[PDB]
Amino acid sequence: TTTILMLPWLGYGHLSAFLELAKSLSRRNFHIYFCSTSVNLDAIKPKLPSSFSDSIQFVELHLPSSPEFPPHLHTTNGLPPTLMPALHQAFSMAAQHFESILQTLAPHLLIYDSLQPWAPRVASSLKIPAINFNTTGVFVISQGLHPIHYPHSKFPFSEFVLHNHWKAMSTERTRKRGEAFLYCLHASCSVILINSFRELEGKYMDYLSVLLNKKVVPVGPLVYEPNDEGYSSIKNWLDKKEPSSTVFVSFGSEYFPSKEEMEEIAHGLEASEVNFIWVVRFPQALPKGFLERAGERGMVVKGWAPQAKILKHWSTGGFVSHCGWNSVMESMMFGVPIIGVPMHVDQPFNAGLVEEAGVGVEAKRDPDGKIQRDEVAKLIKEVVVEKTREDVRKKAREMSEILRSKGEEKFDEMVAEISLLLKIEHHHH
Amino acid sequence: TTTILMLPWLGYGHLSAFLELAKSLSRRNFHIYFCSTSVNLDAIKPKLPSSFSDSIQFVELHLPSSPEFPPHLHTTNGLPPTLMPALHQAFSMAAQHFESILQTLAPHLLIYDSLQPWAPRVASSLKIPAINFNTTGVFVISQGLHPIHYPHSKFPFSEFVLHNHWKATERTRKRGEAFLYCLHASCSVILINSFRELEGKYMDYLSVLLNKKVVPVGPLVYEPNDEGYSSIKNWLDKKEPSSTVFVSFGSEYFPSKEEMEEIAHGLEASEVNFIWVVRFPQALPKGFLERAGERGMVVKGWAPQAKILKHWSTGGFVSHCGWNSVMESMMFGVPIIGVPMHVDQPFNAGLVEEAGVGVEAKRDPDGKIQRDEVAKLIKEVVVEKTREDVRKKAREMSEILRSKGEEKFDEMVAEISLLLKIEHHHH
Numbered sequence: 035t036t037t038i039l040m041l042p043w044l045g046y047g048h049l050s051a052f053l054e055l056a057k058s059l060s061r062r063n064f065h066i067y068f069c070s071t072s073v074n075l076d077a078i079k080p081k082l083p084s085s086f087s088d089s090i091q092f093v094e095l096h097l098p099s100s101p102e103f104p105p106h107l108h109t110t111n112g113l114p115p116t117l118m119p120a121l122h123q124a125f126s127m128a129a130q131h132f133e134s135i136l137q138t139l140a141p142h143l144l145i146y147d148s149l150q151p152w153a154p155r156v157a158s159s160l161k162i163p164a165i166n167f168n169t170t171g172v173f174v175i176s177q178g179l180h181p182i183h184y185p186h187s188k189f190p191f192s193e194f195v196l197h198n199h200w201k202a203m204s205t206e207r208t209r210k211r212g213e214a215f216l217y218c219l220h221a222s223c224s225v226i227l228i229n230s231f232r233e234l235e236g237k238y239m240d241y242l243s244v245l246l247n248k249k250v251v252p253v254g255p256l257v258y259e260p261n262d263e264g265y266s267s268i269k270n271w272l273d274k275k276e277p278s279s280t281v282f283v284s285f286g287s288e289y290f291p292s293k294e295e296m297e298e299i300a301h302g303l304e305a306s307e308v309n310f311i312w313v314v315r316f317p318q319a320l321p322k323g324f325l326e327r328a329g330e331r332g333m334v335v336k337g338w339a340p341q342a343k344i345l346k347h348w349s350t351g352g353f354v355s356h357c358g359w360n361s362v363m364e365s366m367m368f369g370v371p372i373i374g375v376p377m378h379v380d381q382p383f384n385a386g387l388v389e390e391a392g393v394g395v396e397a398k399r400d401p402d403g404k405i406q407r408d409e410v411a412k413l414i415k416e417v418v419v420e421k422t423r424e425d426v427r428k429k430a431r432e433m434s435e436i437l438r439s440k441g442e443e444k445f446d447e448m449v450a451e452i453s454l455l456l457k458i459e460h461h462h463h
Numbered sequence: 464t465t466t467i468l469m470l471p472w473l474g475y476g477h478l479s480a481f482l483e484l485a486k487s488l489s490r491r492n493f494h495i496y497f498c499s500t501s502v503n504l505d506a507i508k509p510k511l512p513s514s515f516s517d518s519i520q521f522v523e524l525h526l527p528s529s530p531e532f533p534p535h536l537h538t539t540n541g542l543p544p545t546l547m548p549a550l551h552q553a554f555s556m557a558a559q560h561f562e563s564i565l566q567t568l569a570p571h572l573l574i575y576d577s578l579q580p581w582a583p584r585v586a587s588s589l590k591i592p593a594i595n596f597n598t599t600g601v602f603v604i605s606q607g608l609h610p611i612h613y614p615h616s617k618f619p620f621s622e623f624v625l626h627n628h629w630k631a632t633e634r635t636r637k638r639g640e641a642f643l644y645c646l647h648a649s650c651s652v653i654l655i656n657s658f659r660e661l662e663g664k665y666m667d668y669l670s671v672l673l674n675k676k677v678v679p680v681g682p683l684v685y686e687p688n689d690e691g692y693s694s695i696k697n698w699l700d701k702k703e704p705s706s707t708v709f710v711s712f713g714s715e716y717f718p719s720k721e722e723m724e725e726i727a728h729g730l731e732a733s734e735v736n737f738i739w740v741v742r743f744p745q746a747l748p749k750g751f752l753e754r755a756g757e758r759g760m761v762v763k764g765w766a767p768q769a770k771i772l773k774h775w776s777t778g779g780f781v782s783h784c785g786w787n788s789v790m791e792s793m794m795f796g797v798p799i800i801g802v803p804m805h806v807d808q809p810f811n812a813g814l815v816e817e818a819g820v821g822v823e824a825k826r827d828p829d830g831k832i833q834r835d836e837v838a839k840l841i842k843e844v845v846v847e848k849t850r851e852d853v854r855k856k857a858r859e860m861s862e863i864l865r866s867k868g869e870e871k872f873d874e875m876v877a878e879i880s881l882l883l884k885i886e887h888h889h890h
């Protein structure tokens with residue numbers, strides 16, 4: 035039995051995408067060691083059906099621990115942003131435990147995320163072949179690598195323009211971050227895997243492959259679908275609404291919008307008169323009277339909501355989303371138009387790809403980089419409340435039809451590449 | 464590797480349901496020998512993706528052959544109804560070749576259909592455990608078995624009444640004895656293509672009446688990925704959403720000229736868009752296609768039923784209510800307009816109506832189809848959509864069925880595991 039150890043970065047969206055990939059490999063008769071910190075393994079375990087537990091086994095990675103940084107903070111999920119430097123420093127210090135895990139389990143293959151340059155170095159030292167898996171889409175990576183080779187040329191194959199707000203958000207420190215990220219891709223054996231699909235990003239995949247001089251293999255759409263978490267009361271509330279009348283509002287697992295940002299979002303929801311379910315979180319807030327004036331149109335869920343189940347409900351007509359890639363992939367699969375309110379990292383590029391595909395719209399920031407309640411209201415009105423953007427709704431339906439038609443063949447290329455790589459390395463061993 | 468030989472009855476609907484069940488066992492690491500006549504194996508091979516061919520292997524069963532009854536007629540698909548006695552007799556005579564196949568391949572398990580009492584007998588003689596798999600739903604079986612045990616009491620848990628057209632001695636008893644033997648002879652359990660949200664109380668009742676465990680393995684529904692589709696798709700793409708009915712009477716029925724006349728006039732009066740599969744043995748009123756214009760399309764011989772039912776333009780399914788077609792329509796959320804023809808179909812239409820995911824065009828007292836019934840129901844369900852209730856339940860049923868996954872086969876796999884562990888001891 036061929037064994038693969040999988041090492042996602044310590045973020046919930048990363049663990050989620052890796053676990054969907056783990057199931058696909060389990061269905062192809064691989065045995066999977068799924069390796070993360072205990073707090074992340076606990077968070078993702080409800081997403082693993084019991085039928086997989088014989089072939090997908092959780093392996094705890096130990097980070098350095100202190101009473102000031104204890105194991106329940108060894109995740110980006112709800113982490114105070116100012117502990118991100120500590121979290122990254124401790125993850126890099128896990129390389130010795132990770133070496134011991136690889137020596138004990140001796141897996142045939144390592145699949146690793148793009149935030150751990152040490153991981154393919156440890157694997158190589160044990161003669162364990164290793165492949166990089168990216169849980170972003172392709173667009174953002176191609177946009178970052180293009181200016182390195184073509185500093186005086188516009189990015190081709192897109193009219194996307196990154197807002198000045200993110201253009202400025204020591205160039206030497208920024209360079210070293212990019213060198214570590216690219217090393218993870220560059221070090222990958224023969225191919226890199228990425229959670230995307232050609233109908234959406236084929237031209238960018240081909241370009242990235244030319245730029246990196248490595249084959250890019252899509253393995254998406256990777257989308258978790260559950261089989262209470264508070265859904266019983268949420269479903270009963272959604273059941274009282276008209277079809278396609280409600281927006282779900284969420285900024286993912288590792289972002290806390292500021293008070294000023296929440297004000298613009300809240301006033302936008304209010305002016306649109308939409309029904310809304312809004313997940314509000316606080317690290318491990320709303321205008322006075324906002325909920326009271328919303329009345330039965332609004333619901334705030336504290337901490338966490340059953341995102342997939344809400345997006346699949348017949349009452350849901352829109353998704354006000356930070357445009358994290360898993361959330362975008364879910365919304366496309368479920369056919370819910372995205373109203374993009376991107377915040378940072380890959381999100382503004384994801385919102386631009388959503389907009390260019392015609393399956394969603396982006397709420398634009400003002401020149402000073404602030405969210406605009408007027409934009410948010412206008413786009414919710416057009417996409418959900420009055421539905422004058424029938425073009426967006428049609429493209430969203432058509433994309434979901436495309437994504438629902440994909441099956442296990444989406445993994446054929448990855449499996450063939452893994453097979454070839456292990457047969458070659460067995461010779462060289 | 465545990466091996467299973469599967470022996471459907473020689474009908475396309477049966478091979479279809481058996482192949483979907485074969486795929487589910489293959490994903491559970493069984494090796495499948497899929498056994499049927501060559502004409503049937505040829506017909507079903509497009510529905511088997513290449514990824515399965517290493518673990519689902521086709522095995523040819525030979526029936527007796529003659530120039531008057533050659534191998535391309537060894538199927539009910541498009542077969543002249545007056546050759547059905549010959550096909551059944553030929554299938555019985557295949558029991559010898561079937562024994563040789565079981566001896567050669569030595570499968571660990573036989574799964575067999577309900578039209579071959581000799582099959583579990585051959586398996587038993589070779590000490591091969593055998594399980595019956597039914598490609599109907601359960602309602603029809605419980606309705607047939609109930610009056611045997613309760614001749615003076617009405618069937619419970621349903622108000623369905625079988626029209627006198629289908630109501631109307633020793634030969635009938637002998638047919639029922641052979642069918643029930645297939646179920647009764649099954650080892651430990653019978654398998655059936657159904658699911659509890661739709662037929663739970665009937666499964667429980669059948670299990671009591673047969674004194675055997677009934678294990679559901681449904682919904683079993685083929686979904687594809689040309690065969691004419693590219694042109695049909697371009698035609699559907701020009702229609703309004705949910706505006707079009709697909710019309711089909713399955714693989715082994717040819718409606719009479721009289722029936723075709725009533726269906727045709729019902730379609731015309733409704734002013735619905737329609738795609739209608741019309742077949743001739745291995746027809747329409749004069750001017751009907753002309754007057755229909757671009758509203759109607761006749762497809763000769765065969766159509767990509769699943770792709771059509773899944774299209775955004777399809778709002779209804781005028782169906783003979785064969786069980787695979789009912790299961791597909793429920794899975795895809797398309798309301799059924801039932802025009803059942805024979806065998807289990809009037810019972811299936813009754814269950815559809817009871818569940819509220821479709822409606823049944825009722826026949827006249829003398830058994831004739833009524834063009835006014837067909838037109839009225841198409842108008843109410845598809846064209847005017849005043850039966851919002853039917854469309855909603857169809858949608859809610861589609862969501863239920865889409866929520867099911869690989870767990871629907873857990874009970875079957877566990878029973879198979881137990882049965883083989885027991886019989887390994889005894890042999």
Ligand SMILES: C[C@@H](CC[C@@H](O[C@@H]1O[C@@H](CO)[C@H](O)[C@H](O)[C@H]1O[C@@H]1O[C@H](CO)[C@@H](O)[C@H](O)[C@H]1O)C(C)(C)O)[C@@H]1CC[C@@]2(C)[C@@H]3CC=C4[C@H](CC[C@H](O[C@@H]5O[C@H](CO)[C@@H](O)[C@H](O)[C@H]5O)C4(C)C)[C@]3(C)[C@@H](O)C[C@]12C
Nearest residue numbers: 151155182183212213214215216217218220244245246247
């Ligand atoms: C800084 C360097 C690695 C940083 C890490 O360091 C590692 O640390 C040690 C211990 O930790 C490890 O043990 C490793 O040994 C050591 O890593 C080695 O680092 C050397 C360079 O120091 C590589 O040579 C060698 O391979 C690699 O192993 C880090 C973060 C851990 O410190 C990065 C890795 C990805 C990479 C190679 C990119 C992406 C891909 C490349 C480009 C430049 C040019 C090429 O691209 C081609 O250029 C043509 C002209 O335009 C195009 O025509 C064509 O299209 C395009 O393909 C290429 C594919 C090589 C490019 C943009 C380079 O600028 C800079 C590179 C950014």
Ligand SMILES: C[C@@H](CC[C@@H](O[C@@H]1O[C@@H](CO)[C@H](O)[C@H](O)[C@H]1O[C@@H]1O[C@H](CO)[C@@H](O)[C@H](O)[C@H]1O)C(C)(C)O)[C@@H]1CC[C@@]2(C)[C@@H]3CC=C4[C@H](CC[C@H](O[C@@H]5O[C@H](CO)[C@@H](O)[C@H](O)[C@H]5O)C4(C)C)[C@]3(C)[C@@H](O)C[C@]12C
Nearest residue numbers: 118122123126148149150170174210211212214215379380
């Ligand atoms: C691989 C690289 C990713 C870079 C890409 O980003 C990613 O891109 C998205 C795709 O779009 C992804 O999906 C992720 O979401 C997104 O990642 C997030 O990005 C946001 C803001 O951008 C952060 O807020 C958040 O935290 C981070 O996770 C990028 C920037 C190219 O885009 C990661 C980022 C953090 C980082 C730089 C750490 C931490 C700090 C560094 C170390 C190595 C050495 C240095 O650190 C050493 O240690 C101490 C630091 O002070 C000092 O003592 C000493 O001087 C120094 O040597 C250094 C500072 C460079 C170290 C351990 C590196 O190996 C590996 C790095 C892990």
Ligand SMILES: C[C@@H](CC[C@@H](O[C@@H]1O[C@@H](CO)[C@H](O)[C@H](O)[C@H]1O[C@@H]1O[C@H](CO)[C@@H](O)[C@H](O)[C@H]1O)C(C)(C)O)[C@@H]1CC[C@@]2(C)[C@@H]3CC=C4[C@H](CC[C@H](O[C@@H]5O[C@H](CO)[C@@H](O)[C@H](O)[C@H]5O)C4(C)C)[C@]3(C)[C@@H](O)C[C@]12C
Nearest residue numbers: 547551555577578579580599603637638639641642806807
């Ligand atoms: C198991 C039984 C199924 C009976 C059930 O039906 C099924 O129920 C649905 C579920 O709802 C299913 O899904 C199927 O669609 C539906 O099936 C179809 O039903 C329609 C009309 O309803 C036919 O048009 C069509 O053909 C048939 O497939 C039923 C009736 C209970 O409902 C089958 C049907 C035919 C039959 C009776 C044959 C053929 C003929 C018979 C033999 C056995 C012995 C006899 O043979 C004679 O033996 C004599 C010596 O004793 C000789 O004198 C003589 O020469 C010889 O003929 C006999 C005539 C009874 C024989 C070989 C039997 O083993 C097995 C039988 C195979």
Ligand SMILES: C[C@@H](CC[C@@H](O[C@@H]1O[C@@H](CO)[C@H](O)[C@H](O)[C@H]1O[C@@H]1O[C@H](CO)[C@@H](O)[C@H](O)[C@H]1O)C(C)(C)O)[C@@H]1CC[C@@]2(C)[C@@H]3CC=C4[C@H](CC[C@H](O[C@@H]5O[C@H](CO)[C@@H](O)[C@H](O)[C@H]5O)C4(C)C)[C@]3(C)[C@@H](O)C[C@]12C
Nearest residue numbers: 580584611612639640641642643644645647671672673674
């Ligand atoms: C006619 C007979 C089989 C015909 C075939 O023959 C086979 O042919 C030989 C070679 O071909 C083979 O070698 C087989 O040996 C030989 O088959 C044997 O045939 C005898 C009876 O001759 C059985 O005894 C024995 O098991 C079985 O092996 C064939 C091929 C000719 O077609 C049929 C099979 C299914 C069956 C048993 C049913 C369904 C289930 C049963 C019922 C009635 C009573 C029971 O039901 C219970 O009744 C209670 C009171 O109401 C309720 O309390 C409870 O709820 C309910 O469970 C029971 C479960 C047994 C019932 C209605 C019976 O009438 C009649 C039966 C119809």
Ligand SMILES: C[C@H](CO)OC[C@@H](C)OC[C@@H](C)OC[C@@H](C)OC[C@@H](C)OC[C@H](C)OC[C@@H](C)O
Nearest residue numbers: 179180181182183184185186209213216220245
């Ligand atoms: C540490 C990293 C990698 O280890 O350093 C690598 C560094 C070399 O950058 C490599 C790559 C990113 O760019 C290659 C570049 C040299 O290409 C020049 C080309 C565009 O020709 C134009 C040139 C001015 O004019 C053309 C002239 C012939 O007319």
Ligand SMILES: C[C@H](CO)OC[C@@H](C)OC[C@@H](C)OC[C@@H](C)OC[C@@H](C)OC[C@H](C)OC[C@@H](C)O
Nearest residue numbers: 174175177178179182208209212213216379380
């Ligand atoms: C914002 C969002 C983040 O999620 O977008 C990310 C995107 C920007 O991706 C950046 C990444 C794909 O490239 C990083 C790059 C900017 O770093 C430069 C470094 C690798 O140069 C190497 C080497 C010296 O260059 C050789 C050159 C001098 O010839």
Ligand SMILES: C[C@H](CO)OC[C@@H](C)OC[C@@H](C)OC[C@@H](C)OC[C@@H](C)OC[C@H](C)OC[C@@H](C)O
Nearest residue numbers: 603604606607608611625635636638639640643
């Ligand atoms: C009348 C019902 C509902 O109105 O519809 C009939 C239809 C549902 O039948 C389909 C079939 C599935 O069930 C028939 C079979 C279960 O029993 C038939 C019986 C006459 O054969 C003799 C039988 C073995 O003998 C047993 C005993 C009397 O010896």
Ligand SMILES: O=c1ccn([C@@H]2O[C@H](COP(=O)(O)OP(=O)(O)O)[C@@H](O)[C@H]2O)c(=O)[nH]1
Nearest residue numbers: 047286287288313338339341358359360361
């Ligand atoms: O309240 C919530 C918020 C998020 N999610 C899930 O968390 C994932 C978030 O990943 P994404 O890539 O969208 O963004 P990230 O959290 O990485 O920023 C997605 O699977 C969402 O469905 C959820 O289930 N409930």
Ligand SMILES: O=c1ccn([C@@H]2O[C@H](COP(=O)(O)OP(=O)(O)O)[C@@H](O)[C@H]2O)c(=O)[nH]1
Nearest residue numbers: 476713714715740765766768785786787788
């Ligand atoms: O033109 C056609 C007619 C039928 N079918 C398929 O054939 C099966 C018919 O089986 P059903 O149980 O509905 O009735 P039967 O043919 O057994 O009477 C179903 O999978 C249909 O999708 C098809 O694909 N194209």
